[PDB]
Design a protein around this ligand. Structure first.
Ligand SMILES: Nc1ncnc2c1ncn2[C@@H]1O[C@H](CSCC[C@H](N)C(=O)O)[C@@H](O)[C@H]1O
Lengths: 536, 100, 362
C-alpha cells in the first residue's frame, strides 16, 4: 500500500533541497552587520577625538579684482551666485608611459539541464522490491527526466563517488620526500622521475621558464661507472674470492650486522652510481662496516642558415638521416641535437685563440657567440665574474648590461640614454622580453595595433618576441632612420638573442636610436617622425 | 643603476610556479626553490660554473639547508645533477662532508 | 526609506560633472561640506536650512586643460585642518588648503592618468591612486614620498578604476575593466614597515630616495562574476559589494560562507553568491554612487536621473526593499552621488553641470 507512496515521494525529495540555499544567509546577514556596527563607531570614536577646522568663504582680492568669475544657478528657485576662479599653480607637462615590470631576460610564451543523484543503493530495493505493487533501477528512474543524468551517465557519476572515497590524501603516484620522517623505499627510477620530469637540460635547471618537449635522459656514454672490485679500498673492506670481479661484469669470510628499511632506500641508489664501490656506498649510507656492506650488497644483488628555430634534432639509432629535424630546419646539429661529432652538422666552436670577436673570427664572422668552452683558447671561460677577457663574445653570457638612462624624448614621449661614452660597435643590453608564437603574435599584434603600441618583434621564421607587459630599459629607446646605434640578432648555444651596438663613436648624453623593421602600416603610424626642418 | 642579475619579483614568480605543483613534495620543492634562487643570483652557465655553483651553494646557504635539515632530498638532488653529467663524484662528497 | 529633493543647482561650464564627496572630515556640529570637481574646475558647497545652498570657494585650471575627475578628502592630523586631494587626466596630484587658499605640493610620476583618489580611513595623510595603467600608485602626502606600488605585472588585464578601503585599512582592492577581482593586504609585514620609513626620510639624509616596493600578487581573483563592464566595487566587512554595467548590483564573499577574508590565498578563485540587486537603464560606465558613513543605506543614481534606494539592514536583497526615487527635470546622467556624514542630507549629480540635493525625512 504505502510502499509505493513512500517510494513515490523518494524521487520528489530533490525539490526540498531547493530552498536550502537561503538557510544561512540571514544568519550571516546579522553577523557581518553586527561587526560593521562595532567598526563604524570606532572610526567615528576616533573621529570624535580630533577637532576639525570649519570653512572660510572667499573675498575680493586687491591684486585679483578682475579675476574671471563663473556663475552657478539653481534648477529650483534658489538664487544664482557668481564667484571668481583662482587658477592653480603650473604643472610640468610630463610625457606618458605605461606600467610594466623590470624584465632582464627572455622567456618563452546557465542551462536548463542539470545532474545529481543519491547513492542509496542499499535501500533502492526497498524503493523497488519492497516498493513495487530493484537496486539497479535507480539509474533508470533518475533517467526519465532530463533534470538528472541518464542511467549510463549516472554510472560514470557513481564512478566518481568511488574516486571520491579514495585512499589517504596524496596524489596517486607521488611519494613522500626522503627528508621527511616517513621516507619510503622509492627506487631510483621512480624517485628520480619527479626530478626527471621537472629538470630541463637546455638551461640546466628544473622547469625552464624560457623553455611538452621531453627526451629520455638515457645517456649515450659507457653503460656503467664501475669503481672497485673485490678489494679493500675502505679501512676494512672485503676481497673474498676474486672470481666475482668478472661476475660483476657478468652481472652487467662473511660477516654482517643489522639494517634499517629507511637506510636501504638509498643503498641501491648508491649501487646505481658506481655499481661496485664497496666503500663510497658504505661512506654515504650503511649500517654495516665497509667489510659487511658487501654482504648486504651481494644478497641485495641476488635479490642556408638561421631563419628557423633551433631544436635538439633527434635520430637515436639511425645517423643524421632525413628524419633528423636539423635537415629540415637548415641549421646546425648542435650538441643537444642527437648528432655526434661524426655528424657533419656538428659545430666546432669559437676557434679563435687571441681575440674571439675579431673581424676574422667564427664568433664574430658568424651569428654565434663563443661559449666558455668554445674560445677557451682566448679565455672564454676565464673568470666569468671578472669582466676582463679577450673573448668579447660573452657579454650577454656574462650579463654585462649597460647603464641605460631613462629620459623624456621630444621625438616620442620618453627615451633611453647611456651613462658612459661608447665608441662604434660596443655592447648595449639586450631587448629583454618574452617569446610568443606566430599565431598569438597575430593576436597580440592586432591588440597592440588596436592600442597603437610598439614592443613586438618577429624573432625568426618560427617565433616572435614580445616585450610589452614585461621588458627591459632599451624598449623605451626611440627610433631614427639615421640611428646612433643598431640592433643585431645574436645566437647563443641554439638560442635566439639580439645584440645592440653603437654605430659610431658616442659620448655620454646621446639618445639611442634604431629601426623597428615593422610592417608598412606599423611604421608610418608609429615612426613617421624624424625631426627635420623645412624652410620653403 | 638598477642593473642586477635578477629582479626581486621574478624570485616569487618561480616560487609560485614551483609551488603550484600538487604532485611535488615540500622538501624537494623548498630545496629547488633555494636552488633556483641562487643560480640567477650569480649567473653561472658553464659546466665548471655549475660545478662552482654547487660548492658555492654549500658553505654559503647549504648551512640553511642544514638549518632546514633538508639533506636527503638535496643528496638525491646532488646525485641527480651528477647523473645529469654536470657534476663529478668528488663534488658531491663536499656537501656530504660539510654537514658531517 | 525617506529622501526627498528640496534643492538643486546648475553651473555655467556645461561639462559633464564628476565626483562629489561630503566632508566626513568634520565634527558633529561643525559646518559639514561637500565639494565638486569639474573637468578643469573645482568648487565646494555649503548646506543650509530651508534648502538654502551657498556656493563656496571655486578654482579653475586653464594651463592643464585635461579632465579632472578624481578627488579624496584630506585632513592634517597635526594642524587639524581638512584639505582635498584632486587629480585628473595627467596623473599630477594637486592638494588644496582652503585656509592657505593655495595649492603648493609636488606629486608627479603617474603613468597615464588617475581614475580614483581615496585616503586611509585612519591615516589622513596617505592617498590611494588608481591607474588605467593596470597598476596601483601610492603617495605619502605629508612626507611627499612615493609609497609602494601595486599591480605592476600581475595586475588586471584591462583598465582599473575602482577600489575600496576597510575601516581598518587592513587590505586594498583592485577590480579592473576585465571584471577580475584582485585584493592586496595592507597588513603585510613588508607593507607596514615601508609605511613607517615613509615618514622617516630627509632630503639631506642620503642621496638615495625613499626605496619604494613593488607588490604584484593579488590575494584573490575571479572573473566569471561579471559578464559586463564593472565600474563599482565596495566592501561590507568580509563581503565584496560590487556593481557592473549589467543592470545588476551584486555582493559576494570568496569561497564558502565560513571562509574568513583575512586568510585567503592568491591561487583561490571559488566564490559563493549571496546577493543580487538589479536595476535599469544604468548599463553604462562613468556611473558611481555614494554610501552613507555608517554604511546602512545607498542611493543608486541613473542616467535618466532615477535614484534606486535599497537598505542593507537585516532586510536583504533576498527581499530587496525597493525605493526608486526619481526627478523629472534631470535626464542627462548621474555621474556621482554623495551621502553626507549624517544621513539627513543627500546630494545627486546631474550631468549637464547641474546638481540636485535631496534631504532625508528622518
Ligand atoms: N621614433 C618614433 N617617433 C615617433 N613615435 C614613435 C617612435 N617610436 C615609437 N613611437 C611611438 O611610441 C609608442 C611606443 S613608446 C616608444 C617611443 C619612445 N621610445 C618612448 O619611450 O616613449 C608606439 O606606439 C609608437 O607609436
Amino acid at each position: 500500500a504505502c510502499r509505493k507512496r513512500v517510494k513515490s515521494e523518494y524521487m520528489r525529495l530533490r525539490q526540498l533541497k531547493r530552498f536550502r540555499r537561503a538557510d544561512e544567509v540571514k544568519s550571516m546577514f546579522s553577523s557581518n552587520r553586527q561587526k560593521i556596527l562595532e567598526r563604524t563607531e570606532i572610526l567615528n570614536q576616533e573621529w570624535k577625538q580630533r577637532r576639525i577646522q570649519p570653512v572660510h568663504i572667499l573675498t575680493s582680492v586687491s591684486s585679483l579684482r578682475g579675476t574671471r568669475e563663473c556663475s552657478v544657478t539653481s534648477d529650483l528657485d534658489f538664487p544664482t551666485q557668481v564667484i571668481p576662479l583662482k587658477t592653480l599653480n603650473a604643472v610640468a607637462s610630463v610625457p606618458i608611459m605605461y606600467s610594466w615590470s623590470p624584465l632582464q631576460q627572455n622567456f618563452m610564451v546557465h542551462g536548463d539541464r542539470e545532474c545529481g543523484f543519491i547513492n542509496d543503493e542499499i535501500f533502492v530495493e526497498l524503493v523497488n522490491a519492497l516498493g513495487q505493487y530493484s537496486d539497479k533501477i535507480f539509474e533508470a528512474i533518475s533517467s526519465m527526466f532530463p533534470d538528472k543524468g541518464t542511467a549510463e551517465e549516472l554510472k560514470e557519476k557513481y564512478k566518481e563517488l568511488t574516486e571520491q572515497q579514495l585512499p589517504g590524501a596524496l596524489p596517486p603516484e607521488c611519494t613522500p620526500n626522503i627528508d621527511g620522517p616517513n621516507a619510503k623505499s622509492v627506487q631510483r627510477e621512480q624517485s628520480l622521475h619527479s626530478f626527471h620530469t621537472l629538470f630541463c637540460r637546455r638551461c640546466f635547471k628544473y622547469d625552464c621558464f624560457l623553455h611538452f618537449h621531453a627526451t629520455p635522459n638515457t645517456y649515450k656514454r659507457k653503460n656503467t661507472e664501475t669503481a672497485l672490485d673485490n678489494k679493500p679500498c675502505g679501512p676494512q673492506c672485503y676481497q673474498h674470492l676474486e672470481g666475482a670481479k668478472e661476475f660483476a661484469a657478468a652481472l652487467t669470510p662473511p660477516e654482517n650486522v643489522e639494517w634499517s628499511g629507511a637506510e636501504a632506500s638509498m643503498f641501491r641508489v648508491l649501487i646505481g652510481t658506481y655499481y661496485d664501490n664497496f666503500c663510497a656506498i658504505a661512506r654515504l649510507i650503511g649500517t654495516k662496516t665497509c667489510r659487511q656492506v658487501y654482504e648486504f650488497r651481494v644478497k641485495e644483488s641476488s635479490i642556408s642558415n638561421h631563419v628557423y628555430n633551433y631544436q635538439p634534432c633527434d635520430h637515436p639509432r639511425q645517423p643524421c638521416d632525413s628524419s633528423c629535424p636539423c635537415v629540415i630546419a637548415q641549421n646546425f646539429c648542435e650538441k643537444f641535437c642527437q648528432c655526434s661529432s661524426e655528424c657533419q652538422n656538428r659545430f666546432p666552436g669559437c676557434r679563435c685563440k687571441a681575440q674571439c670577436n675579431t673581424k676574422q673570427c667564427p664568433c664574430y664572422l658568424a651569428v654565434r657567440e663563443c661559449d666558455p668552452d668554445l674560445c677557451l683558447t682566448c679565455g672564454a671561460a676565464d673568470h666569468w665574474d671578472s669582466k676582463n677577457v679577450s673573448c668579447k663574445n660573452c657579454s650577454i653570457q656574462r650579463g654585462s648590461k649597460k647603464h641605460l638612462l631613462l629620459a623624456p624624448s621630444d621625438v616620442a614621449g620618453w627615451g633611453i640614454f647611456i651613462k658612459d661614452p661608447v665608441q662604434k660597435n660596443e655592447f648595449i643590453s639586450e631587448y629583454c622580453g618574452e617569446i610568443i608564437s606566430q599565431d598569438e603574435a597575430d593576436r597580440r599584434g592586432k591588440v597592440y595595433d588596436k592600442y597603437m603600441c610598439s614592443f613586438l618583434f618577429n624573432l625568426n621564421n618560427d617565433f616572435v618576441v614580445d616585450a610589452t607587459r614585461k621588458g627591459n630599459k632599451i624598449r623605451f629607446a626611440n627610433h631614427s632612420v639615421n640611428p646612433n646605434c643598431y640592433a643585431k640578432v645574436m645566437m647563443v648555444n641554439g638560442d635566439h638573442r639580439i645584440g645592440i651596438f653603437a654605430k659610431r663613436a658616442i659620448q655620454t648624453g646621446e639618445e639611442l636610436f634604431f629601426d623597428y623593421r615593422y610592417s608598412q602600416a606599423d611604421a608610418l603610424k608609429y615612426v613617421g617622425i624624424e625631426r627635420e626642418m623645412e624652410i620653403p | 643603476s638598477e642593473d642586477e642579475k635578477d629582479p626581486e619579483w621574478l624570485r616569487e614568480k618561480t616560487i609560485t610556479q614551483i609551488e603550484e605543483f600538487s604532485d611535488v613534495n615540500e622538501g624537494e620543492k623548498e630545496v629547488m626553490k633555494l636552488w633556483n634562487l641562487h643560480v640567477m643570483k650569480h649567473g653561472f652557465i658553464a659546466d665548471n660554473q655549475m660545478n662552482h655553483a654547487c660548492m658555492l651553494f654549500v658553505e654559503n646557504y647549504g648551512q640553511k639547508i642544514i638549518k632546514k635539515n633538508l639533506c636527503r632530498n638535496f643528496m638525491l638532488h646532488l646525485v641527480s645533477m651528477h647523473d645529469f653529467n654536470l657534476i663529478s663524484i668528488m663534488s658531491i662528497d663536499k656537501a656530504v662532508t660539510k654537514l658531517r | 526609506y525617506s529622501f526627498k529633493c528640496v534643492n538643486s543647482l546648475k553651473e555655467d561650464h556645461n561639462q559633464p560633472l564628476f565626483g562629489v564627496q561630503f566632508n566626513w572630515h568634520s565634527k558633529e556640529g561643525d559646518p559639514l561640506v561637500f565639494a565638486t570637481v569639474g573637468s578643469n574646475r573645482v568648487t565646494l558647497y555649503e548646506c543650509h536650512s530651508q534648502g538654502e545652498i551657498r556656493l563656496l570657494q571655486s578654482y579653475v585650471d586653464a594651463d592643464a586643460d585635461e579632465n579632472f575627475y578624481t578627488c579624496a578628502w584630506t585632513y592634517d592630523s597635526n594642524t587639524s585642518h581638512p584639505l582635498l586631494a584632486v587629480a585628473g587626466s595627467r596623473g599630477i596630484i594637486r592638494i588644496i588648503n582652503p585656509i592657505t587658499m593655495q595649492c603648493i605640493k609636488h606629486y608627479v610620476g603617474h603613468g597615464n592618468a588617475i581614475n580614483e583618489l581615496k585616503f586611509h580611513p585612519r591615516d589622513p595623510n596617505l592617498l590611494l591612486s588608481v591607474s588605467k595603467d593596470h597598476a596601483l600608485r601610492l603617495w605619502n602626502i605629508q612626507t611627499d614620498t612615493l609609497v609602494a606600488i601595486f599591480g605592476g605585472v600581475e595586475g588586471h588585464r584591462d583598465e582599473v578604476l575602482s577600489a575600496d578601503y576597510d575601516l581598518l585599512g587592513e587590505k586594498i582592492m583592485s577590480c579592473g575593466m576585465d571584471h577580475s577581482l584582485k585584493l592586496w593586504r595592507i597588513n603585510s609585514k613588508r607593507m607596514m614597515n615601508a609605511i613607517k620609513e615613509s615618514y622617516d626620510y630627509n632630503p639631506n639624509k642620503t642621496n638615495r630616495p625613499f626605496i619604494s616596493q613593488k607588490i604584484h600578487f593579488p590575494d584573490f581573483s575571479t572573473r566569471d562574476i561579471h559578464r559586463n563592464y564593472v565600474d563599482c566595487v565596495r566592501w561590507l566587512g568580509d563581503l565584496i559589494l560590487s556593481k557592473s554595467c549589467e543592470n545588476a548590483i551584486v555582493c559576494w564573499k570568496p569561497g564558502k560562507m565560513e571562509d574568513d577574508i583575512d586568510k585567503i590565498k592568491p591561487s583561490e578563485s571559488n566564490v559563493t553568491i549571496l546577493g543580487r540587486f538589479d536595476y535599469s537603464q544604468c548599463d553604462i560606465w562613468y556611473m558611481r554612487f555614494s554610501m552613507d558613513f555608517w554604511q546602512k543605506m545607498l542611493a543608486l543614481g541613473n542616467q535618466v536621473g532615477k535614484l534606486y534606494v535599497w537598505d542593507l539592514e537585516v532586510e536583504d536583497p533576498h527581499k530587496a526593499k525597493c525605493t526608486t526615487l526619481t526627478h523629472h527635470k534631470c535626464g542627462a546622467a548621474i555621474r556621482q552621488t554623495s551621502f553626507s556624514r549624517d544621513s539627513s542630507i543627500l546630494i545627486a549629480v546631474c550631468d549637464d553641470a547641474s546638481i540636485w540635493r535631496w534631504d532625508r525625512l528622518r
